[PDB]
Design a protein around this ligand. Structure first.
Ligand code: HEM
Length: 425
């Protein structure tokens, strides 16, 4: 009904309501359904009263529980000490088998030296011609998707997720890899079934999920085998040709890197853009400031959108040895969860953490993690994707605004918005 009228604004800088520590149940799915004000107040209570605490996994096999690190300094320290806080082979709270974790996770589930081998050769594949292709695709696909929003919608209403934030990062990944247009339908279907496993409200058939995950891997392996014969100016070809000290990637390694990208390089940028449109809709003075000086404010605006959205809520590690932090003794083998959503509101680190300030500087947020060995390999591409999406909104539909509160994804790991209706003139 009200899909033609702007959502309520909020007063910028307002802290979340006080949340009693007894109300906080990180191991309960019902807790993850509470809205972001209750969640943000919950992590505020933990930072203040119980900054390291142990929680059960969400069940629905219950596994071992995890120590939640909620303070910026603890998440930073854990990120920079991977010999103690290991990523091998699990980076979510629920454990996967090592072979499945490596198949879907590529370098993100490895420690050095295997991680550094893989990351160094992948990094070398981002050659000048490949980077030029990627940068042209970001602008082409953002411009087309926003133009299509206008062409497809005489009522000037659309769902930002389905029409812009959802397709943009996966179309860019298709273009970067050199995937033909005619294969988008298969890549989107496979990717949507894989992502859907992360949504407990969307039925995921197990057999269908295993078969799409085999097919997408076979598809990327065949794409790499073709580029071994036929060099194109795309990332698949530079991945097959890249070499560090004689070491080269197998086609199987390339395929798993692609499977990592269609999740980790895709739903994260989607949610940064959708939370950024939500935030501009709640704080229109920030939208006005940015539009008044788009290029001058873009570098700090994009970082503040990532700090504010924290699209990756947490990453997990596993202790290789006993450690005591803040007086809390944790044992070798224990799970540790690193709450970037909470680090990104830590009052010791950020002046006025509840203010959404697109001029914020400095902004040492941990939305791409705490830094160190696994620091987001796509961070510069994500920053460009965010900037150019907002640039195309500003150029083509500058008053675009959310018209209904978002439908939120029920997830502990992904700060997901499933739908965000918008309207424009
Ligand atoms: C706003 C969007 C994004 C966010 C918030 C995000 C966040 C993250 C985080 C938190 C990590 C783990 C960092 C750590 O453990 O210390 C990560 C890793 C990674 N991300 Fe991103 N990411 C985004 C976009 C992208 C994009 C666009 C790409 C590429 C298309 C990408 C590729 C990767 C890769 C390959 C890794 C694994 C790096 C490693 O293990 O060494 N990310 N990202």
């Amino acid at each position: 009904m009200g899909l033609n009228t702007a959502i309520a604004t909020r007063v910028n800088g307002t802290p979340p309501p006080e949340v009693p520590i007894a109300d906080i149940e990180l191991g309960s799915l019902d807790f993850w359904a509470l809205d972001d004000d209750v969640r943000d107040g919950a992590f505020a209570t933990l930072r203040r009263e119980a900054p390291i605490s142990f929680w059960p996994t969400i069940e629905l096999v219950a596994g071992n529980g995890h120590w939640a690190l909620t303070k910026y300094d603890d998440v930073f320290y854990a990120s920079r000490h991977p010999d103690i806080f290991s990523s091998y082979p699990n980076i979510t709270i629920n454990d996967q088998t090592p072979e499945l974790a490596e198949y879907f996770g590529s370098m993100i589930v490895l420690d050095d030296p295997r991680h550094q081998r893989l990351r160094s050769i992948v990094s070398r594949a981002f050659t000048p011609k490949v980077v030029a292709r990627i940068e042209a695709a970001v602008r082409d696909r953002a411009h087309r998707l926003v133009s299509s929003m206008i062409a497809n919608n005489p009522d000037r209403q659309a769902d930002l997720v389905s029409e812009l934030a959802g397709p943009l990062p996966l179309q860019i990944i298709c273009d970067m890899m050199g995937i033909p247009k005619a294969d988008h339908q298969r890549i989107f279907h496979w990717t949507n079934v894989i992502l859907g496993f992360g949504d407990p409200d969307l039925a995921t058939d197990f057999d269908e999920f295993m078969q799409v995950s085999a097919d997408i891997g076979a598809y990327a392996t065949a794409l790499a085998e073709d580029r071994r014969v036929n060099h194109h100016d795309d990332l698949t070809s530079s991945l097959v040709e890249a070499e560090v000290d004689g070491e080269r990637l197998s086609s199987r390694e390339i395929a798993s890197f692609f499977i990592l990208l269609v999740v980790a390089g895709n739903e994260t940028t989607r949610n940064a853009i959708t939370h950024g449109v939500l935030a501009l809709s709640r704080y229109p003075e920030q939208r006005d400031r940015w539009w008044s000086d788009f290029d001058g404010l873009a570098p700090t605006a994009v970082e503040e959108i990532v700090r504010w959205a924290s699209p990756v809520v947490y990453m997990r590690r596993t202790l290789t040895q006993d450690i005591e932090l803040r007086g809390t003794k944790m044992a070798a083998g224990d799970k540790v969860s690193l709450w970037y959503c909470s680090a990104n509101r830590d009052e010791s680190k950020f002046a006025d953490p509840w203010t959404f300030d697109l001029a914020r500087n400095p902004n040492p947020h941990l939305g791409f993690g705490g830094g160190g060995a696994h620091f987001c390999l796509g961070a510069n591409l994500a920053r460009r994707e965010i900037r150019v999406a907002f640039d195309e909104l500003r150029r083509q539909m500058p008053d675009v605004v959310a018209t209904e509160e978002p439908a939120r994804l029920l997830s502990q790991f992904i700060h997901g918005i499933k739908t965000l209706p918008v309207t424009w003139s």
